[PDB]
Amino acid sequence: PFTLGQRWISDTESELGLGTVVAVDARTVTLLFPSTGENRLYARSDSPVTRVMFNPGDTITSHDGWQMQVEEVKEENGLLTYIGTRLDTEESGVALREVFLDSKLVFSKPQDRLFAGQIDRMDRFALRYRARKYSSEQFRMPYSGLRGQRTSLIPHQLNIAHDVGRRHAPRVLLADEVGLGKTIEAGMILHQQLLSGAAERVLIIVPETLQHQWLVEMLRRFNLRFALFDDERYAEAQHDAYNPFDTEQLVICSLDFARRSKQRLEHLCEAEWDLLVVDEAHHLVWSEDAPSREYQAIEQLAEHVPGVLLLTATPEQLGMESHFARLRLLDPNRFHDFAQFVEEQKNYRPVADAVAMLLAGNKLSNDELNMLGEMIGEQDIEPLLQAANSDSEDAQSARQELVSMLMDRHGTSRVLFRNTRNGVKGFPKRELHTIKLPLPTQYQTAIKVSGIMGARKSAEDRARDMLYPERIYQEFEGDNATWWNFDPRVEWLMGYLTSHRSQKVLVICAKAATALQLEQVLREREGIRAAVFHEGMSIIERDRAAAWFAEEDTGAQVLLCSEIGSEGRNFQFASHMVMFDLPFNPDLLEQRIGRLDRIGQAHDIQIHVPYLEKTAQSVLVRWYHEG
Amino acid sequence: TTIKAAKKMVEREEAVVWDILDEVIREHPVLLNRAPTLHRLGIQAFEPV
């Protein structure tokens, strides 16, 4: 029924408007969309279009902007031509060939779709209804924005997320201890802000060695995508617009990069960000008489953006006073010197003593009570105090509300946050076993010669050599010498593994070559499927191995870590840990044990550690476990 | 619950599969044939065991 000149609408591409039949053939028809001026060619069969016509009495608009009131419509040669009375001047009888309608047709209300002959399938109506219903429902939950992050449910984290995510332009001091999850809290805050729409542009400042980590973490936990600005990218984006720093929404940059040119620092200062994220704030050193070079630039930045998050710790076990050095960035008015702040902390300390004594369940001196009476400025203290002090029936809630009142008067309760291992429950217990093994002679034969060469070398380095004998046996006898054929340790490990086929075991060793050789021995001598995990791999192969180790009953049984960089996935089902050999300084030993000592263990960790007698291991096991 | 669960349960050959299979074939004749089929008694319908 297609004939030249008519007006048709594309079924699916309604974002074009009306179209006109320019030419026809036996199988192909051509339409022009003047509103965009675009040529389209449709095959006659299957008719992916629809005809448009206006019923008498309605209104039509011509291309010159003057409406009409249609009264009759004629058809000739298949072509439909309208007649109506104008509405601007109300002249009657004016006719329009339909090729003089608008260029933009709208069907904003669906009944025009239905009347024009547009029918979809039934199911899509069901989806539309259910979709809008669920959206309406799920927007409103009080705790929305805290279910999409890939982390277990840890209350001392959700509390901070709830507290700081429901502020306006917050500015806090996240100074949690290591192993507690400061960066997880920062991610939670960013997620909570970005989901409610409360902010859009975010700056993040981290030094060069850490940048990549942040990228991957974000992309794999909080579903946020970032762009990286280095010297290169900023250079070619200098052309692209006036401020290159306006092309994107979330930005990663290092402070040393911003300090390269001051014009660049101004470019950062002038881009109107919402949130600023600062990393390792404890490195940023300031003195009242010596304001450092790095301090001034961040001080300049902190004045044009409302919200700041600071990531820091309190190293070298120095008191909270040092936090003052940065706190001036948050609220420069309330802080005006350090001496008064230290004085107030000194004043708080006896009150801390009193509350510690009270919560311990022991009686309070009446002389001390008129320091808690001073610290809170009221006069209804005594009825509360006598009840809470003598262990009454409701002394617990009395004490709780009293300490709540003192909390409301804390110096830095709402501006500073701390988590310590001591006060929060959930950590599992660490149980030890030890086994000693007899020394085979070949090691003595090798050591009697090796004891000479490391003469003009550190006792640190001399011990670092002798500590683990295998790597010196290799040097005398040639590399890949068959050292795994008379050790007691390998035999003990195989014996232990093969009698407990239902335990997942994490074996950690010294370096990569040792890990690979242990894996080969196990695989070809006892058929124990083992998965290696060392620091030369890519980031995908690590994921493949860690995925295999997690299969519950058909997958691997032993994970051979080689001096792990503590990138630290959650190994929630591994409970036993075998320490093949021992390192020097205890911090990385805590690293090792904390690869499994995280909140959420079902059972308590058990550590094994077999050692050869009369060697470095003999000294070190004693020194660690007993000293 | 789903088809893939059934695929794996059948391939691993767990005893419930043997019980179900013994249930299904009951009262379900099959056709046995031998070629060449010269006359109409060439294919017949038996009942499995």
Add this chain to the structure above:
Amino acid sequence: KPERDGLFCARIFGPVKDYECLCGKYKRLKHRGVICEKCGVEVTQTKVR
């Protein structure tokens, strides 16, 4: 690729993959029937070869 105007031409007979043209501009349901102009193959099933 099928030569144009040859014994396998996609202009004459049909597409090679479902709801895709040859050059690769339009794709998969929004352009149903839209005879693409630059390569000239209708966008329908391949059970038309």
Add this chain to the structure above:
Amino acid sequence: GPEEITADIPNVGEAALSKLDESGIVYIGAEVTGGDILVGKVTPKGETQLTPEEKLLRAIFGEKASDVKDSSLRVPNGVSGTVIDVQVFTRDGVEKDKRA
């Protein structure tokens, strides 16, 4: 381009790759049952071009240049047994892998 024989096959679980050495050929003595892998082969295919952001990503995650099919050899189903002998033929001009 050219095929390759390798152990890094895209989209295989770690389970099936215990029984291949570095060069990607079965051990001698390992006993196979229908469905396993005998030789790891990958066939390169078209290289479509890209945007800088994924260049950064694929340089951090670090895995590939030429997203590539696999067409390895596998035991046709219903067969089993115990491999007893592996032979490798090479041209004159191809670098000899370790196992040959």
Add this chain to the structure above:
Amino acid sequence: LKAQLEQGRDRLLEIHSNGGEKAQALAESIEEQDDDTNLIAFAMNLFDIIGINQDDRGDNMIVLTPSDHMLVPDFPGLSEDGITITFDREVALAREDAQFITWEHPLIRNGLDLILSGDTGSSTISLLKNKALPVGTLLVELIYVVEAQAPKQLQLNRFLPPTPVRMLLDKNGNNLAAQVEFETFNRQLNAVNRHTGSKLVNAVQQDVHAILQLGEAQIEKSARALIDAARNEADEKLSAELSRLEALRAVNPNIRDDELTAIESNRQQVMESLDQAGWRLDALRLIVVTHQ
């Protein structure tokens, strides 16, 4: 050194940062929340309609891949290699290789936007099987949307998000939506072929324009109540926040004037904006009763 350290504690900070019993109750609440099965039965259907193949693997892992019949050329999150998703929390904690799909993941939000924003499913014509009922009766389904307009940083989402009203009219404008549930009603309907439905609507062409303005009489009053109720909640909770914040302000030097000024301004703006709500008609379905 251990004794000297343990004497140097400031336990008020620790008892403050832990949250208390309320934080534990909150965590448990989310724990009970994470066992929803509505999301699975919704997401599976949505992905089957948009046209994403779901191959099931078995260990609570499903792989998604775009198919040949997809509703849109290119989608935000997918790629022709397919991705893996899991709705459980523990499995997703052990496998940092796989996505974690909840009500806040970009796939759900982008699919929701694609369905809602466009015009799919708006115009449907159907048929109903009831020989117990007179021939030629009319039933019309109306999908009313209640809306407010304001920039996002006012977060109207928490008071009056786009809210639906389902309306079921007869020839004399009497409701049946309040009586019959959607699923039981719709499970008895069926469809019609395209061409016959194309004309069948025309014979009742005027009747539709007769129907709507009947329901327009009541929908507005419904709208009023929602805004009225909404305003009350907008009045209530924020004021308590107001009530709380300055209550702390007069006691400690850690409260800035900017926060309270901003919240007062936001309250006035949100009240004024929510006093400007509107409503539109988004979808409609025709129901014609036959004796077949």
Add this chain to the structure above:
Amino acid sequence: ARVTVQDAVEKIGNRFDLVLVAARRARQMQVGGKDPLVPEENDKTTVIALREIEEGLINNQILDVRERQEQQEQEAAEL
């Protein structure tokens, strides 16, 4: 009728019409949701239809009468 189908043949008349009648009845039990008459004894629907035919309960006209009754009565009770 587990083994031999001799009686039903005399009970209806052809080796062929028996097939159609029994198939229709077993269909009614298969999906239509009706209930059998002779006790199950842990047997498939097909042999149940054959036993019903042999005993003299499900002929052809009986099927017609029964379906007519159910149709009319449900239609009348619709209002």
